[PDB]
Amino acid sequence: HMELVRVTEAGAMAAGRWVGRGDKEGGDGAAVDAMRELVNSVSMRGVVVIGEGEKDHAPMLYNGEEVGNGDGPECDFAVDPIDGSTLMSKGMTNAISVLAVADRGTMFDPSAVFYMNKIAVGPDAAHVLDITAPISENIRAVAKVKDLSVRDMTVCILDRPRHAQLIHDVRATGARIRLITDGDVAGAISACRPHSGTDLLAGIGGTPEGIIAAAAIRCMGGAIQAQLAPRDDAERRKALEAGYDLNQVLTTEDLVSGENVFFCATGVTDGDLLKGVRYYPGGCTTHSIVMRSKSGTVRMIEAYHRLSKLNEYSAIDFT
Amino acid sequence: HMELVRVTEAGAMAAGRWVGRGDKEGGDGAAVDAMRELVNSVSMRGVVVIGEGEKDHAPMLYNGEEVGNGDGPECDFAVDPIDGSTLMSKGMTNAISVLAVADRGTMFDPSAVFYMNKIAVGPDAAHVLDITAPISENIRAVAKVKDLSVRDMTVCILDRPRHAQLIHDVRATGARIRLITDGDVAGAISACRPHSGTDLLAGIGGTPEGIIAAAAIRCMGGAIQAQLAPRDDAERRKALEAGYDLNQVLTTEDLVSGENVFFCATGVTDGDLLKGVRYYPGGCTTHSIVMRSKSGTVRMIEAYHRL
Amino acid sequence: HMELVRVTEAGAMAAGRWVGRGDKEGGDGAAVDAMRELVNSVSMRGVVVIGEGEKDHAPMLYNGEEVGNGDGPECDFAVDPIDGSTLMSKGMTNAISVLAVADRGTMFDPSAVFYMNKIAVGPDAAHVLDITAPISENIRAVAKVKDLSVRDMTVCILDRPRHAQLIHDVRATGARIRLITDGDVAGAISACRPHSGTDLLAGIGGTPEGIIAAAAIRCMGGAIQAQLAPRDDAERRKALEAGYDLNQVLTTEDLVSGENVFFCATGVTDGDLLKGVRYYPGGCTTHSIVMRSKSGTVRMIEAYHRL
Amino acid sequence: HMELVRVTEAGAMAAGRWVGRGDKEGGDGAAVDAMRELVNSVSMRGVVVIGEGEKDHAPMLYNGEEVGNGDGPECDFAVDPIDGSTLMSKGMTNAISVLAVADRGTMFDPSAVFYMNKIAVGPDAAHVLDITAPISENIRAVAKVKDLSVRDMTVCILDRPRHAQLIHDVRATGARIRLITDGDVAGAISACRPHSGTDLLAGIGGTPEGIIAAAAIRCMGGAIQAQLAPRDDAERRKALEAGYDLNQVLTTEDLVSGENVFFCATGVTDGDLLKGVRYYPGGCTTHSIVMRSKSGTVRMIEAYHRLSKLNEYSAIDFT
Ligand SMILES: O=P(O)(O)OC[C@H]1O[C@](O)(CO)[C@@H](O)[C@@H]1O
Ligand SMILES: O=P(O)(O)OC[C@H]1O[C@](O)(CO)[C@@H](O)[C@@H]1O
Ligand SMILES: O=P(O)(O)OC[C@H]1O[C@](O)(CO)[C@@H](O)[C@@H]1O
Ligand SMILES: O=P(O)(O)OC[C@H]1O[C@](O)(CO)[C@@H](O)[C@@H]1O
Ligand SMILES: [Mg+2]
Ligand SMILES: [Mg+2]
Ligand SMILES: [Mg+2]
Ligand SMILES: [Mg+2]
Ligand SMILES: [Mg+2]
Ligand SMILES: [Mg+2]
C-alpha cells in the first residue's frame, strides 16, 4: 500500500514552510491539515488511535476520528505529524513526519501513561534485550552478540535532566552517545537500521512515540522493549486502576500486535536517515521510507514534486 | 498508482537471475512471465497495445491481451520486459525493464511502420527541436540553450549501419557520441534527465520503443519528435493507405495523447539512470523510477526485498 | 598541493575516536596533536596565524608557531582542528576539521576584534550581497537570482541570544531558518555550495572562522562580506587606534588576499557537505574537500585508510 | 604522491573531446600529449617502461624516454593513455586513463611477448588461484573460499574468438560472464575490488595491460597470475632465446616487484568503477582512483575543473 507515503509527503511539505520559523503549533497545524486531507482521499477505513489528542484540544486527527474514504477494511491509524515539533520550529536536524497503520484494535493504548522507558536494537541483537537490567548490561550483551567492541557501540539518548544517570552509565561503559534533543521515533528507527551509526536507543520518552516506533520495528526487524513510566503517584494510581501491570515488560508485538502493519515517514529537516524537504525553482524534493510487516519489503522513496508547470523549469537531480 | 512499480520490479528481479548467462530468450521469457503474473494482480483493466507481439508467435502479453484483475477504466498498456535483452545476456550496462499506461486508445499504433526516426531532449531545450532540420542545427541550438559548447555535447545514437550518415554528420559538428548497441528507450530517457551524461538522442529505432519513451516524456518533461521510417516501398504502401502523412512531424503527444499517463522502469543491469538488481543472502535490492503526467511527480524507488 | 588533505584527514581520524564521548577537550586535543604531527611532515614553510591561540595557554599550533619541515615559500597557515568541538562531543552533525593556506601576510588579523558580522552566499548570487542593507533585502535579492520564492529560502544562523533580532527579521520575511549551535565555517561553506539545503549564512560569529571561510570562498567561488563587531567600548577602543574603519565592508579578498589560496576540510561527524569518519575492522574512511584559488579546482576525496 | 592523479585527469580530459568521434589515434595522441606535459611538470625522475612503443613508431612516451622535472628518485613509469582506444572512439562504457609508478627496474618487460593469459581476484581469494588448471577449477575454488554459490560468480572476459572455449567453460560451470570488448586493465581492477559485481578476470590480453593491472593489484590487494602467450612459434622462439621460462607462472610480485608502487586512473567514459568526463557550462568533472602499496590507502577523487573564470558560472554538484 505504497500510496500512504503521500500522506507523510504532504505533512512534510506542509511543515517545510515552517522550518526554523519559531512556531511549533503553526507547522503542526499545517502538517496535520495536509495529512488529514490526503488520508481521507485514500481507500482505507481508519480510526485515529494515536493522533493530536482527544475530540476538543485536538480539532483534527483526534483520538477516535474516522479517516479514509470509507472503502477498505477497518484498521488502526497512528500519525505523528512531526516527531519533535521543536526540531522543525528551530530548523535542526532529524525532524520526520510519520504514520503507521495496523489491524483494528492491535495498537496499544497511547493514553495508558504519558511516558514509557525504552530500549531498541536491530535484528541481530533482537533477543538479548532486558529493559529491567542496567544499561551497561544491555550494552555489553548487544556488543557481544554483534561482535563489536563496547567502545564502538553508539547509544541514542534524549538529552534530558531525567537521563543524567543513564547518560553517565553509558559513558562509564565506554560506549558512545548520540545526544538528541527530540525525536525518539527517528532515534528508534536509526538504532534498528543495520548500518546507520547508532546501535541502541535507550531512555524514557513518549508512549505514543514508542508505539509508532514499534510499528516500524514490526516491519523492519528488530525489537523494542518498554515499560510504562508514571510521572507521579497520581498517574501511577490511574494506570493501576485502569488494569495495567506496571511490572509488565512490553515487547514489540505487545505495542503493535497486528499481522498487517505499515509504516512510512518523510524527512522534514535533514536527518541521519532522511533528507529534509529541499526546494528548487520548479518545486521540491521529499525523501521517504515505506515498509510493510507482511512482506518485509523496505522502500526508500525520493520524489520530485512539480509545484506546477511542465517544461517551464529545469530538470531535477537526485543523490 | 504507484503500485505498478512492482511489475517492473518483478520483471527486473526475474531478468536479473539471467544477467550474464548468454541466453537472450531465457531472461526475456522469465521477465515476461513475472510481469504477466504480477500485472494481473493490480487494480487495473488494461489492454496490451505494446508487448511481446501477435497472439500466435507470443503466448504472453500479446497484442490485445486483457491485463489486470481488473477494476478501473480500460486503458492502454505497454510493456517492454527488457529493452535490449542482449544487454542483459552479455552483462552489459543500461538494461531496463519498462511499462507505460495511458488512457484507452491514446497510444499511437505500434504496427503502422516498424521504424521511426527520433530526436529527444530534456525540458530545458525541448523548445528548439526540429527533426526536419539537419542534425547539426539541432545540436548547436540545444547546446546554446544548455550554455554548452558543441564539443561539450554528447549525442546518443544506436550503433547500426543505417546510422553511418547520421554518425558522420554528428562527428562533423564536433559533438561527442555515445553509441549504444541496444536500448533507445533507456537512451531517450537519459537524453531527457539532467546530469546523465547524454544531452540528445537521435536516429532511427523501433516504433514501439518511441511510443514508450514518449509516455515517459509526457511525465517527466522534455520532448521527443518522430517521423515514421518505412523500410521498403511495401511498408510505405502499407503506411499511406493506412492514412498517414509521412511529412508529418509527430510530437510527444501524437505518440501518447492521454491526459492520464503513467511510466515506470526498473534497472536490470547498472545504467546511467538506475542501478541494476543486486542479490545477497537475505534478499535483493531494485532501483526504479516512477512518474505520472497529471502531477508531474517523479519518484526514485529503491526497494529492499526480503526473499 | 593536494598532500595537505592528510592534515585534516589526520585531525578528523583523531577527532572521530572521540565522537560522542562527552569530552570536548579530549577530542580537540587529539585533533590538534594529530594535525601538528602531520603538518610538520609536509613540504611547506608555514607560520600559524590562526590556530589554538597564544603560546602561553596553547602549547600546540599557537600564534606564531612555524610549521612544515619546511621547504617552499613562507606562508600563512590557519587551522581549526574541529569547528565546534561540542558537535563532536555530543555526536551531532556537521563537525568538520579544517585548514587554510595563503601567501604570507595575506590573511586578515584574527585578533583585531573577536567577532564579525557575516553574510555569505554562493557564486550565482554573490553579486547582490550588501551587508549594510537589511537582511530582508539580501534575502529577496538572493532569492530572485536563484529563481526561488522567499519562502523557499533557507538561511543558516548561529543559535545565540545576540541573534534574536536577526532571527525575528528573517522570520518576518518568510524565509526558513537552519539554526546551528556551532560551526559557521561549515555553515558558510554550505551557503556557497549548491544543493546543500542552505542558501545564505548570516549573523555574528568568530573573526578567525570568518577568515577561514573566506579562504574557502576564494577557491570555490561565492562571496562573504563582513564587518568587525566589537564586544564592548574597550574593543572599539582597541579597534580604532589599531587603524580600522568600522564602517568598512570587508569582502572575501579583504579577509584573504593571496593569489595562492588553499583550503581543505575533512568530516568528523556527518554533515551536509561531508560524511564523517567511519571506522571498521580493517580501517576507516574519511570524506574530504580540497580546493585551490589559482585553478579553482574543487576536489571531493574519499579515502579508505588501512590501519 | 597524490599529485600524479593530475596526469590521468589530463589524459582523460584530453580524450574526453574525442569520445565517440571515431578516431582512435586522434584521442590517443591527445591523451598522450596531455599526460606527458603534466608528468614532466611533476617532481619525479621516471623512465617510460610501458608506453606508446619504441623511439620511432612512438613520437611521445616511448619506451626509455625520461619523464618528470628531474627532481626525485629514479623510478619505473607505466602509462596507458586509454585502456582500449576503441571504447573511447565509439563512446562505449569503461574506457579509463591509467598510470603506474614503481621502483626503478621492478616492472616486468612488456616486450617479452605481446600477449599473456591472466586470471585475477580480490584479496579474500588471493591464494587459491591456479592459472594452469581449467577455469571451472578456479571458479569453484574462488566460489568456495568466498562462500558464494558458483551461479553467483561473475567472470569478466574479453569478447574474442580466441575465448570461445573459455566462455563456454565458464557458462557450463554455471557462473555468469560480463563480456567486455576492450579494457582488461579496468576489468582486472573490478575483479579485485571487493563489492563491484565481478569476482574474476580470466583470459588472454595484452602483456603491458597485465603488468599495469599487477601494479594496481599490488596496492589494492588481491592477486593476478599470468603466463606469457606466444602468438606463434616465431614469437615462441624469440621469448625462449631471450631467456624466458615459458612455463613460469608469473605472480603479482613477478610482474611488478617494487615495494613503493603507485597506481591511478581516471574515467574517460562512464564505467563500472569510474564515471567518465562530464561537461557542464563552467567546466568538467573527472572521477579518479589513486592508491599506494606502501600505505595501502585507496582514494576516490572527484574533481571539478573550471575551464575558466570564478563566479561567472553556476556552482557544481557531485554524487
Ligand atoms: O519532551 P519530553 O517531555 O521529554 O518527551 C519526549 C518525547 O518528545 C519528543 O521528543 C517529541 O514530541 C518525542 O520524540 C519523545 O518521545
Ligand atoms: O535492432 P533494431 O532492428 O535496429 O531496432 C532498434 C530497437 O531494438 C532495441 O534495441 C531492442 O530490441 C530497441 O531499444 C530499439 O528501438
Ligand atoms: O560561540 P560564540 O562565542 O558565539 O562564537 C561563535 C564561533 O564558535 C564556533 O561555533 C566554534 O567555537 C564557530 O563556528 C563560531 O564562529
Ligand atoms: O585487442 P587484443 O588484440 O585482443 O588484445 C587485448 C588488449 O587490448 C585492450 O582491450 C585494449 O588495448 C587491452 O585492454 C587488452 O589487454
Ligand atoms: Mg513526536
Ligand atoms: Mg543501527
Ligand atoms: Mg526494446
Ligand atoms: Mg571554529
Ligand atoms: Mg590498453
Ligand atoms: Mg569484485
User: Which atom of ligand 1 is the closest one to the Cα of A86?
Assistant: 11
Question: Is C300's Cβ below 8 Å from some Cβ in D?
Answer: yes
Say yes or no: A118 and A248 in one domain: yes
Residue A221 φ then ψ, to 5°? 95, 155
Unique residue bearing C-alpha cell 559513558: A171
Residues B92 and B65 in one domain: yes
What residues of chain A, 5 to 24, have a C-beta less than 8 Å from chain B? Answer: 5
d(CA C134, CA A206): 42
- The identity of residue A250, as a single letter, is L
Distance linking the first and last C-alpha atoms of chain C = 24
Closest CA to D34 of D12, D1, D64: D12
CATH code: domain of residue D119:
3.40.190.90
Dist. CA C268–CA C287, nearest whole Å: 9
The reply to whether C109 and C214 lie within a common domain is: yes
Locate the ligand 3 atom nearest the alpha carbon of residue C206 and give its number: 16
By DSSP bridging, strand D278-279 and strand D200-206 are unpaired
User: Within this chain, do residues B214 and B129 fall inside the same structural domain, yes or no?
Assistant: yes
Q: Which of A211, A244, A259 is the last residue of a domain?
A: A259
Ligand 2 surroundings by CB, under 6 angstroms: B 83-84, 158, 160, 182-185, 205-206, 209
Give D305→chain C minimum CA distance, Å: 5
**Could you write out the three-class secondary structure of chain A?**
CHHHHHHHHHHHHHHHCCCCCCCHHHHHHHHHHHHHHHHHCCCCEEEEEECCCCCCCCCCCCCCCEECCCCCCEEEEEEECCCCHHHHHHCCCCCEEEEEEEECCCECCCCCCCEEEEEEECHHHCCCCCCCCCHHHHHHHHHHHCCCCHHHCEEEEECCHHHHHHHHHHHHHCCEEEEECCCHHHHHHHHHCCCCCCCEEEEEEEHHHHHHHHHHHHHHCCEEEEEECCCCHHHHHHHHHCCCCCCCCECHHHHECCCCCEEEEEECCCCCCCCCCEECCCEEEEEEEEEECCCCCEEEEEEEEECCCCCCCCCCCCC
Which residues span the domain enclosing B82?
1-104+260-307
Residues C133 and C68 in one domain: no
C150 and C83 share a domain?
no
CA distance C56 to C53: 8
Tell me how far apart the alpha carbons of residues C160 and C180 are, in angstroms, rounded to a whole number: 9
Report the phi/psi class of residue B268: left, alpha or beta, with left for phi > 0 and alpha for psi in -120 to 50: alpha
Q: How many domains does chain A have?
A: 2
CATH of the domain at C268: 3.30.540.10
C212 and C121 in a common domain: yes
**Rounded distance from Cα C206 to ligand 3 centre (Å):** 6
What distance in Å separates the CA atoms of residue D98 and residue D288, rounded to the nearest whole number?
Answer: 10
The C-alpha angle D52, D54, D57, rounded to 5 degrees, equals 75
Q: Are residues D119 and D203 in the same domain?
A: yes
Dist. CA A272–CA A253, nearest whole Å:
26
Question: Domain check: are C134 and C65 in the same one?
Answer: no
CA D195 to ligand 10 centroid distance, Å = 5
**Cβ pair C303:D299 closer than 8 A:** yes
* Residue D206 burial class via C-beta count within 10 angstroms: exposed 0-12, middle 13-18, buried 19 and up: buried
- The CB density around residue D225, as the number of other CB atoms within 10 Å, is 22
Do A94 and A110 lie in one domain? The reply is: no
Three-state DSSP state, C121: strand
CA of D193 to the centre of ligand 10 (A): 4
Task: Supply φ then ψ for residue B37, to 5 degrees.
Answer: -55, -45
Same domain, C80 and C48: yes
8 A C-beta contact, residue B31 and residue B9: no
Chain D interface includes C214 (CB < 8 A): no
Cβ contact, residue pair C21, A276, below 8 Å? no
Q: Given phi > 0 = left and psi -120 to 50 = alpha, else beta, which region is A136?
A: alpha
Q: Of the ligands numbered here, which is closest to the C-alpha atom of C229? A: 3
Same domain, B121 and B240: yes
B270 chain-D contacts, CB cut-off 8 A: 197, 272
Do the bridges between strand B278-279 and strand B66-67 make them parallel or antiparallel, or are there none, so unpaired? unpaired
Atom 2 of ligand 2, nearest CA residue: B205
Do the Cβ atoms of A268 and A19 come closer than 8 Å? Answer: yes
Q: Please state, in angstroms and as integers, the Cα–Cα distance from residue C48 to each residue in C9, C63, C66, following that order.
A: 19, 6, 6
